[PDB]
Subunit: 210 residues, 4 copies
């Protein structure tokens, strides 16, 4: 939208561009989803949104994304940044926070189209939102969590320098799933960062966050 400055935000790395999904990018993301996100014998997500039928996925996705855009509040926000490789939407690296002005703590969530995995994009797009969070938002801590049987996202966290932060368990599609929690302080983030990241279009967004 041309009426919400958050649409002008750009986070760029040597291979990726991240930005809030426009109407065009949402449709691209649905196209990517329909080509496949994960092997059907896995469930990497808290909410099993990828189980939805081919017919339902498109609107479920539009709905979720619309709701996330619409729910932005200074004290409770979620930013699902579309990840682009040469202008094409390959996945989402979200960043969110509750009471950010007070806590200075963000968490994240991610997915990539299946054919786009295993090329370092997941590490890079994480490095990208962390740069945004620490350098632009002046976050102090970033957290993430991964199911024990989701080693790609565990490795991404370990690569970006997160430390172990305890264990959780949740109901995952009717069965107990163990989860690992990760924590990244600004110190740790600095000591492990290797991706050159640039942010543009943020000046006008500053007062929305604080």
């Amino acid at each position: 939208s041309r009426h919400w400055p958050l649409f002008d935000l750009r986070i760029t790395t040597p291979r990726l561009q991240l930005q809030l999904p426009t109407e065009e990018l949402c449709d691209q993301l649905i196209d990517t989803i329909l080509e496949g996100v994960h092997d059907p014998d896995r469930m990497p997500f808290s909410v099993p949104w990828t189980r939805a039928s081919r017919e339902d996925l498109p609107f479920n996705t539009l709905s979720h994304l619309w709701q996330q855009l619409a729910g932005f509040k200074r004290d409770d926000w979620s930013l699902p940044l579309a990840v682009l490789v040469d202008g094409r939407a390959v996945g989402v690296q979200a960043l969110s926070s509750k009471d950010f002005p007070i806590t200075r703590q963000v968490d994240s969530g991610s997915w990539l189209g299946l054919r786009y995995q295993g090329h370092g994009y997941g590490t890079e797009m994480r490095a990208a939102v962390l740069y945004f969070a620490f350098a632009e938002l002046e976050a102090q801590v970033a957290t993430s969590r991964s199911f024990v049987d989701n080693p790609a996202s565990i490795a991404v966290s370990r690569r970006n320098g997160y430390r172990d932060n305890g264990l959780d368990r949740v109901a995952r599609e009717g069965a107990m799933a163990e989860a690992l929690l990760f924590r990244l302080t600004r110190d740790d983030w600095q000591r492990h960062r290797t991706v050159e990241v640039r942010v543009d279009g943020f000046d006008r967004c500053r007062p929305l966050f604080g």
Copy 2:
């Protein structure tokens, strides 16, 4: 979106086109809002949204339109149709229903940019959604409410054949306001209809309501 068939719906009258607001149409509706919606000595809405600052109005509108788009369910839907006069979205004629397949009853809500009022677009645009509800959705009853000090929406209802359906009162900006309720039966709609209305691109949407 090209992934939601409701975007293909068009309801046209001799002077108007109504459709679901796309990214661009939402921003056009916002441009119109920022030129003025109603006399400030007046509050024709139960939610005083037009009172928000020039700074807040654009996101508040997006948020709301997005929530409605995201919210479509067979048993609880709201269609916020953009009303186009030239190549500009001048207002919104909404149609909504809870448990529609059972009750077959719809209600409506409306607004037009200040510079567009008084040209008979209010009556024409109500006639358009009413034709859509009765003739395409197969509704049996349509309802509406107006504050007693909003004679233009009262006159639109009367011109379209609606009958008194009782009195209400609500809190409007911390003061009591009286409302008039209106009810249009399918048979009363036939009796009083004068506007030629055409519906296109609904065939693929049909299952969504049924």
Copy 3:
């Protein structure tokens, strides 16, 4: 509770005492419900709560009553008054309002165990809360609604001087039901009232309502 002054409110008529339901009264109420509330061929309630099994009904009722007691706010309250005959709970005459300090409008809901119907308790217990509403809370309007096939509550309303205030239709257990709405102004109440009503224990409650 001895910690909430609304438990001291007493509304008394020649045959009835109405009061907020204590632990004991809630239990009497459930006893009464388990003996039966209406012929199974009928559904007089918006929410089909009497359809629940005999196993589930006791907790459904406690949960419901607990929630209404817990939910009291100045701008949003519901008073599920237990109706006592011979000192034992025979039913509930509820009074409720949203934005009462501004609208000064209340509505009501009621039910009696089967063996307690047709004695005029329903009329008398309506009279009881109408008096409390107008004389004690200074309401200006009371409303009520009945399914068209629920003549006993319709007749209680007509008897207390309410006037027809429109038609509605809802889903009721998977089928369409017509509802009649009723409206009583202060003056109409004062023209039709015949029951002697006394209110005790309200002085300390008064500030909770305005």
Copy 4:
């Protein structure tokens, strides 16, 4: 209530009795609250309910307890057990769980009136619910969280054998507060349980949880 079997549950230790709060016990808890729960320099609670005026405390507390009583569901429950010392309610040892049939994981919350602190009641009351969770409910994990500056609950956790399970930070009365997370497996519970515990009246409640 005599219509909800959970009211028949008794968890007894050599000094304490825990049970769901009846109307009487809720009033005793409030009495205890009005005498004070913690040093006002401190905020041990994520929700600062002890900050309410003495005027609002009683209804806030009834409202909270009624909501927890009323909100019981197989997949989302909270048991706010009254803690009785010499037959009077002196605090609450809550036990709660979301999706328990699948996760087999519980969490807990506690408070005692000032004058009852420092006599081993907190340690013993935790053991009480832990034995109930592990021995009766067939839990596999129990969790707990304490703010860093809340050494009494930390100590209770350590004494009951919980292990460190990470860090969190939250907004606490407008300021950032660090919290510590504790985890206790069935095995570590077994290794460390000293307190003798009897559970009665659970026999009929069991199906409600499974």
